[PDB]
Amino acid sequence: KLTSKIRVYMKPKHVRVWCPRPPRAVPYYGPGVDYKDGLAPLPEKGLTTY
Amino acid sequence: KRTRSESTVESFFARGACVAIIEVDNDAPTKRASKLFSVWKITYKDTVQLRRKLEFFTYSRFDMELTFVVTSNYTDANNGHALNQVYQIMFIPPGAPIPGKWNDYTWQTSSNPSVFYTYGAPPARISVPYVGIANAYSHFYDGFAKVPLAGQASTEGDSLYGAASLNDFGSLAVRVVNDHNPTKLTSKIRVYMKPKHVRVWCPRPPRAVPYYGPGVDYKDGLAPLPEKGLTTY
Amino acid sequence: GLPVLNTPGSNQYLTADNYQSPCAIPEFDVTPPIDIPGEVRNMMELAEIDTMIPLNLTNQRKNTMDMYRVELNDAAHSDTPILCFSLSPASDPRLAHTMLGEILNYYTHWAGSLKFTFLFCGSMMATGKLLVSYAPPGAEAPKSRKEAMLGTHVIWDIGLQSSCTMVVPWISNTTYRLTINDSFTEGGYISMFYQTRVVVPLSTPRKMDILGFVSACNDFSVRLLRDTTHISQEA
Amino acid sequence: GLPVLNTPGSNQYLTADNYQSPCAIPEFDVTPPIDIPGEVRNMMELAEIDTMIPLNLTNQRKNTMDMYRVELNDAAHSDTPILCFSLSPASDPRLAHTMLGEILNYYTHWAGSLKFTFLFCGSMMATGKLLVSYAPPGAEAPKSRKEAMLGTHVIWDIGLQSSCTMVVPWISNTTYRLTINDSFTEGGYISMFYQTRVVVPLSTPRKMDILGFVSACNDFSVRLLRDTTHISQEA
Amino acid sequence: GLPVLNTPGSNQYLTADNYQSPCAIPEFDVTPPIDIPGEVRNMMELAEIDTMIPLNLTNQ
Amino acid sequence: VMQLTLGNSTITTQEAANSVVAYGRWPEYIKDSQPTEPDVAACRFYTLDTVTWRKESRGWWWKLPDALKDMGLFGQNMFYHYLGRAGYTVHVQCNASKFHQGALGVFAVPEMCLAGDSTTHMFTKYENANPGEKGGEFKGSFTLDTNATNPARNFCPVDYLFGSGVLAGNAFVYPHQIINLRTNNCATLVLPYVNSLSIDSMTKHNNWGIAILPLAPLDFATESSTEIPITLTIAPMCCEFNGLRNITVPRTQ
Ligand SMILES: CCCCCCCCCCCCC/C=C/[C@H](O)[C@H](N)CO
Incomplete structure (x- = not known):
């Protein structure tokens, strides 16, 4: 084989x-625009922190 | 007798020189002791010939040609022969993903330049500008x-x-x-x-x-001059 | 036959090569094109479109709408900064997710100036004065209005204009900046302070939000296309 | 298709070849160049720069500063040579480490004349006369001033000029000389003797040092680029 | 790319062939020639020179 | 006989050795192919700390524009503006009489990188790699810093290695001058701006290095000891500053 x-x-x-x-x-889920999880891409950063 | 055709900057620097050797292994993934893929940071300071040639001047401009000479061998002789090997060399510019697994998404080469090589073919050659x-x-x-x-x-x-x-x-x-x-x-x-x-x-x-690190540091071998008499020919 | 030489690089696959290939469907009838509105010929044309900045990335406002707003009140004047961030569009979390940041993530080198716009979403009766300053690289990040007013700055007079735009000059020690986090190509800092205060009359809201936008200038350019760091795939 | 022939030498890698290769970064925006001071277009331009010669390679003065100086005293006249060395820039230890020698070490063949300069670092009151002679190849190396004065020579009059330069003529039996130690392409010898003595008055130093420099002439050229013998790497 | 055909005889070594080859020492300074007496351009020019014949090949 | 007049400063000497313009180019402003220009207010001569030349002296080194960090308006503009550009005029004075012996070599080195004293590569700190007006000294041999707990993190220049692993004899490749006590007691150098960028930070990057080496031993008559003052006076040229911002205060100690 x-x-x-x-x-x-x-x-x-x-x-x-x-x-x-x-x-x-x-993240891409299927050929369409559907999504199920991983909907929190933005990290944490202070408003007045450089 | 002057000519000065081989003493030009082009002639002096237009010579191929080995800068790095990347080692990879083809083996079962379950063997943690084997490296299925390798990553090498691009730099000329891993060698001494081209590094010494380049350090003759503080600033430089040039285009580059990369050549990839591929060799392979077996770790045993009691398992017949293997099939032809195909190698992938992917360029990762600053900020681009670093492959973590041998078959992760980073190898899709959506926008990363990549070169595919078949064993036995003439060594792959590419050109890059400044x-x-x-x-x-x-x-x-x-x-x-x-x-x-x-x-x-x-x-x-x-x-x-x-x-x-x-x-x-x-x-x-x-x-x-x-x-x-x-x-x-x-x-x-x-x-x-x-x-x-x-x-x-x-x-x-x-x-x-001798070169010690990418910088100008040195630790030993600081006596390059030999002994010779002052009035000896 | 004609002598030939197999030069180095032959019999190789390069993902960025350009060689003619045989046609798999000869003599195909190609559908004529039509004038579809919204033609784009350069990616930089998209970088010049204003994008709302997710400035407030606090644990409570993250990954919702509230991260797109910066709060202001009618408290007494203070030198404490209203807003602060670093000019790292391809690395800063607040700017890396904007269209400018997303486009820059596809390239290794970039250059050119930028426009930062701020829109006031308060009431008509609300008025005030605000300062937006850009601290060039190589200096301690501004900590108070006193240090902020030492460099390029603009005055937002809320009451005459509802929006204010500031242009970041190309103050750099290198021809191009890198799209990664490195001190070699620091872009400086951008800070926003109060000038006098936000003034509101009786029966008027005392908490008002402002919206930030970032866009590329006419001199913006990118090079060294590369893969992004905001993409992943299973297996 | 067009008939082709795979001539000998195809499918081979040559480190000194010149073939067009595909561009790995098509349509890259190349940073425009700037006029950086100190442009060099030929390596020989560096060979014409004076380099101090580590003439004294004694066991005590080796690999320090003292090897760059040659001592002189106010003793009575003697025919014993002050300095002696052989015209083997790429092989002689005293000249192989100079810029001329280092450049020659990268090439197999070389030709052209040379300039040898000597600078006096004594006091103003110090005066004297010295002889610098070049013995052509094929003769016993000079052992005394009497044999030295039989060939090309120059007089260094310390008191009128603080520096003296001597040009070595291209007296050779071959078009080019080799950069290795061989009797086939002997370059002769260079020797330095006293003429009368070094004279100093009262309350003046009696031990004075001179500095040697070597440089290439306008007719100097090299060929047959090769690896140097002063480079090593582990593994 | 341009279509090509690998005609018979390719990938072969012939001791009397004439094909251009890459230069191993690019931009070399070739020593100018000099007029050395006794230039010969054809081997037949040597065949016209008288040669003494070893006519007597006796055992002694 | 030489007279160097620049800004509001003038240096007159009668024991000079003409001058050498590094790479044959004088300092010039950036061509087309808001800036701040102090002009004469900054383009003037400033005198650095005078050093002593003895028989045991191994050499001295200074960094530019580091040596001018505290010299009035030039340093103020460097610490107030992110980017800058300026050439240099260097004047070395070494007075001596007719009974003195010795010679000094003044070398202008672009990108004068010096070897560190620690095993770790490039482990010198900023505070020790930027001595300031006082410059530094050369050593006669390489000493390895074994203080693992509190590494010195200083440079370890070697006189015969030029501090960069290169034989001192080849140091003449750089623009250089020779002050021979029997012919001239001073020398001058003109260093144009050198970098890969038109403008660059005045605090993160050093453009030039000035190295003074004792090419010949110092001696005087028949005395057992003698000392010669050496003075280094430097003037910026074609000052240009950009990127005004809050004052920068580099860390010390
Ligand atoms: C599979 C595709 C591979 C593509 C390879 C592209 C790599 C491009 C590297 C550019 C390197 C520029 C040459 C180096 C410059 C100098 O040595 C450095 N500035 C000093 O270390």
Whole structure:
């Protein structure tokens, strides 16, 4: 028995974009926009602390 | 008889030199004693030839060519032969994720430059332009990254002499992308640095004592001059 | 045949290479494009869009709406700073999550000035004067208005303008700054203090919130594209 | 497709090759250069800079400052040489450690004339006359002033000039000399003798030191770059 | 990239071939030549020189 | 015969040795390819502490613009402005009579990094790597600091190694002057701004180093001991300061 793995690499060219969207903030769960946990990305920092 | 074609900065510096050797292993993950992937901080100070050549001048500008010479061998001879190995070398610029596992998300190479090598092929070669934040590369820094200030705690504001601000040029992560062979295999990749379009400024005297650390410190071997009679030819 | 030489680097895969490849679908009928509104040709065009700053990252206001507001009151004048943060857009937690910070997280080197805007969300009757100062690198972070007024500063006159914008000059010892936490490329500090006080009449709210925004200037640029530190994947 | 031939030498790595390689960071914004003082475009430009010669390598003066000085006294005239060495910049211990010697150690072949300078560090009242002679190759090394004065020589008149420079002519049987110790490319010898004596008046130092320097001439050149013999690394 | 074909004879060593090879010592200062007496450009020029014949090959 | 007139200061000498402009370039302001310019208010000569030259002297070293941290308006601007740029004019005076012997070598070193005295690499602190107006001294041999509990964290320059592991004889590669007591009792150097950046911090980075080495032993007539004062007077040139902010107070001790 032999085991083989093929990695598929995608490289776009001549890219034109429209309608910018904000970056994702929570982990991706499914092809859609659903989320279940990990909804606390912001850490703790003092208001008057540099 | 003068010519002075081989004495130019380009000729002097346009020579390949080994700067580091990255060692990786192909083995079962359950063996904690094996390193499935390796990470090496990019720097020319791990060697002495190119370091000595570069330290002849205080400031420099140049493009770089990296060559990766890959070799591999078995740890045993009673397990037949293994399949062809494929190696991945990923560039991690400052602030980019550091791989933690052999097959974690950091190897997706979404935006990190990566080179894939197949054993037996001609050594992989890449070219990089000048990527210094300043206007010229600095081999010496007479200063500190942090300057302690009056009223600061003794546990803050401390930094090593020279520190590293312009020297943060990323790292290289090397792994094997093929399935873990039943028999342990050991691979070593030699990184060769070849500068091009080299411009130099502020010449410095050649090093006289052995290099000890990235800085100018020395501990022993401070007697390079041999004995010779004053009036002896 | 024609002599050939297999130079070093051949038979290698590079993720940032550019070589012509055979077409898997020859003579395909490509759908003509249409003028979709909102064309973007450079990522920096997004960095110039104002983004609300999650300034208040206290344990109680973190990861909710309240982190996007800074509170003000009608108390007597004090030199205690209203707001403080460091000019580390790609490393500071309050700025790393903004669009500027997110874009910078994809690159290793960056340069250019920035615009910091503050909007007052109080009542019309409310009036006051505030100071916004930028302390250049290499100095102890301002601890009071007296030290704040030694450097570049702007006066927000709440009562004539509801918003105030401050431009951070490119005071640096290096051509480009790093997107990581390092003392080599410190960007200075930005602090906000009271000037006299917030004044409100009778039957008026005494607690009023202000909103902060950060945007890139026309000279902003980035280089050395790299992976971000706010992304993860299982296995 | 186009016929191709895999000629000998393909699929090989050569450390001194020159082939175009793919760019790992496409479309990078290169920082513009600035006019840094002290631009150097040829290594030979460094070989023309005077370097103090560690002439005295005795067991007591070795690896300290004293090796950079040659002593003189007010004793009666004698034919015993003051200084002696061989024109082997890349092999002689006294010259191999100078900038000229260090640069030559990186190359196998070299050619051109040289300048040897001597500076007097005595008192103003001190005066004297000294002889600096160059014995061409192929002759027994000078043992006394009588043999020294048979070849090219210069007179150092201490009292009118505090420094004296001598140019070594390119007297050779080969186009280029080797940077290793071999009798095939002997460069001759250089010797320094007294002419009359060092004269000092009362209440004046009677032991005075002189300093030696070596530099390359405008016709100096090197070729066949090679590794040096003054470099080592563990493992 | 540009299509290529590995024609027969590639990846072979021929002792009488003529292909350009990389320079192991780039930018070397070549010593200028000098007019050495006795220049020869063809081997046949030596064949025209008289040579004494060992005609008597007796055992003695 | 030399006269150096700058700002509100003037130095006149009759025992000079002309002068050398480092790398052949005089200090100049940044070209196009709010700034603060003290002009003559800062571009003037300041005298540093005079040192003593003895028979046992091994050498002295100063850092710039470190040596000018306390010299009036220049230091005030350096501590008030984040970034700065300025060239230097260095004048070394070493008086001697006709009966004296010896010679001094003055070297202007860009990025004069000195070896530390501790096993840990680059472990010298800021407070010891920035002596100030008093500079420092060279040692005749390398001494290793074994005080693990309270490391000195100071430099350990070696005279014959130039303090950076390089033979002193090669130190002449840098812009240099020779003060020979039998020909000239003073020397002058012009050092333009040298760095990889057009402007840089005046507190985190040192631009130049001045090294005075005893190229020849000091002697006088037939006396058993003699001392020669050595004076180092330095003037900033083309002062430029940027990034006004609160005063910076570096830690001491
Ligand atoms: C798999 C892709 C690998 C991509 C490799 C890119 C690495 C780029 C490194 C740039 C290094 C610049 C050259 C070094 C400059 C000087 O030596 C330093 N300023 C002094 O240490």
